[model samples]
Target: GQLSEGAIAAIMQKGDTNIKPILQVINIRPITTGNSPPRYRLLMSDGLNTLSSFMLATQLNPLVEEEQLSSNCVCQIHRFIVNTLKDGRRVVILMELEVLKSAEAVGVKIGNPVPYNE
Candidate 1:
């Protein structure tokens, strides 16, 4: 997952509260020949209010894992749920929030053979 790591690190390390966590439409400029569909990024503010963003597909996996109650899908224990509303329309519901009550990582138990990592 690619993040605006610099932005997130700034907030977490420095506790910057001056930035506004806004969701914006980012244009992806084509680096090669051929025009492709424009991409969008979901931006959020750190608890201290610094901007950060990650790929939609990467983030969605964890959400699915949490909703399905499978720790195998995530690297850490996820807590808190999110409700997504798009233009006043309900699009996604019950998005799992990482780092629920604590930031500690929780281990998952394998049922039989396949483990989450594999």
Candidate 2:
């Protein structure tokens, strides 16, 4: 029942992509796309703070929908990339993830995490 406490802050502010952060899925939701491929968004937490700008890559679409990676699940971001869009908004693109703890197991969101931004 442990997590990388400050991983979110480091990833967002310090651009430390090598840590391979293990964070909790605070929430997961669908996004609107132009065509119809189905896109997913995530709200992840690093124990200290929660980030709402996470976008899951399409490759993990099946796993997320099939495995039911719902709220409160803990997952390790095996691969990710932080990109600044043309709008200048930074988004964490989750390329790969593995659920270390299921939502049924971690029923509650750990720590008193507020928003990630300062």
Candidate 3:
């Protein structure tokens, strides 16, 4: 698996776009907000470090219904946008992504990745 190492650090710290990152889905949970579409917060690992600051696009949400974006699934981020909140927290909004491999295929986590502090 071409799990781009250091990609998460680069994107999180610098909001770099030159490096198209591929990561494994570690976990996903709904961020419920009243009177609006609930957001799916993802925890992704780049085979080196894990970042849990991901926000998904509308199209990517369908993958959840079909269970295509289950844990350990590998995906390539095609396009993205970075948002820095008032409190200085960075959110990686994956504008586009393609599922490369499913959880069943990957079978296990790519590497012993440590948490990436936001």
- Quick one: best TM-score, which candidate? 2
Cα lDDT for residue 10, candidate 1: 39
Q: What TM-score would you give candidate 2 relative to the actual structure?
A: 0.91
The lDDT values for all models are 0.28, 0.86, 0.87
TM-score of each: 0.22, 0.91, 0.90
Residue pairs of candidate 3 with colliding backbone atoms: none
Task: Quantify how close model 3 is to the true structure by its C-alpha RMSD in Å.
Answer: 1.5
Please give the lDDT score for candidate 2. Answer: 0.86
Model 1, poorest ten-residue lDDT window? 109-118
- Residue 53, candidate 1: Cα error in Å is 3.1
lDDT of 1: 0.28
Q: Report the lDDT tens digits of candidate 1 across residue range 36-108.
A: 4323233232222222223233344443334432222222212212233465421111133342321123233
Q: Please tell me which model should have the higher TM-score, number 1 or number 2.
A: 2
Which of 2 and 3 is the better model by TM-score? 2
**Residue-wise C-alpha lDDT for candidate 2, range 1-118, written one tens digit per residue:** 4788899888888988888888999888898778876788999998888999999999888877786678889898889999998998899999988888889986688878989773
How many times do residue backbones clash in model 2?
Answer: 0
